[PDB]
Amino acid sequence: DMDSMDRQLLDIIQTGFPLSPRPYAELGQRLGLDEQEVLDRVRGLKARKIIRRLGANFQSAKLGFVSTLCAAKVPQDKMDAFVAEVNAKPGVTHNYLREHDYNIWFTLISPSREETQAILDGITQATGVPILNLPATKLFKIRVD
Amino acid sequence: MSHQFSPEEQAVLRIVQANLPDSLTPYADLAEQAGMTEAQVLELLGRLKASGAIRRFGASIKHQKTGWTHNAMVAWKVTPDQVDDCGRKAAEHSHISHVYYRPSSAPDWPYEMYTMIHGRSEAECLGVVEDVKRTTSLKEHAILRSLKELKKTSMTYFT
């Protein structure tokens, strides 16, 4: 629930918030609005949680980072220890208990394929549980919208 | 990160990965916190936006036109000759958001084509599984139903 100027503003700032010294003045000139009103409107939409975040979103691969999907057959007696060693890694962003023999599925991001492998080997060493390192070699569909 | 960026550049990037300073001149505020000029801030952000290192420089909004809910992680058996064909065909579906090919040398894990399925009711997700079976050569599969979300975090590239 907002006005057409907020819809036009959000249509611009989603593609690109202006990379200029006075960006709200640049938005004001494009929208036919006073510089301060555009700041007021952005603050309001942020406060109402319509704007989640205003900043940079990176493309991991272009920063020299590699990503993988990891899987393990975790027995009930090793569960709490394994889950804790996995979650203690900052490179792990997603961890899930899944309905299969391979019941622990997690994402691991790091600067290289060698560092990711050393992290996985380090986990196996502490828990006694082997891990499948499954990087993607081909991408057909990706969600960001 | 030290190999691609100067300490000052990394300082700008540590802030922008969170939020832009809340003012009329955010690039001047970035410049003073990092030990750079405003023009240098703009050149760094412009360079990474141009190269694609910054996929998006702006606002993250609540969804777009998305409601809820049901997710379905399904892994399929695939031979090398089927890969591109099955990949491209499975990805043409509206209810699928992720299609990955992840080779596996593990004897007890023969599934390598991954489709992330969406929609509503459990049966609608099972329906897209039937849609993939009629529209592709993919047959044998494993449904990896989420039982518990153990960690959901965002990656911090600049520490």
Author numbering:
A (entry chain A): 22 to 166
B (entry chain B): 1 to 159
Give the published text:
The AhbA/B complex is a heterodimer formed from two similar protein subunits that share a near identical fold.
We also present the crystal structures of AhbA/B from D. desulfuricans, as both an apo heterodimeric structure and as a product bound complex. Native crystals diffracted to 2.23 Å and the structure was solved using 3 wavelength SeMet MAD data. The full sequence of AhbB was correctly traced in the structure except for the histidine tag, which was disordered. The AhbA linker contains a single turn helix (α4) that is not observed in AhbB. This AhbA α4-helix is stabilized by the N-terminal methionine of AhbB. Superimposing the entire AhbA/B dimer onto AsnC using AhbB as a template demonstrates that the N-terminal domain of AhbA is angled towards that of AhbB.
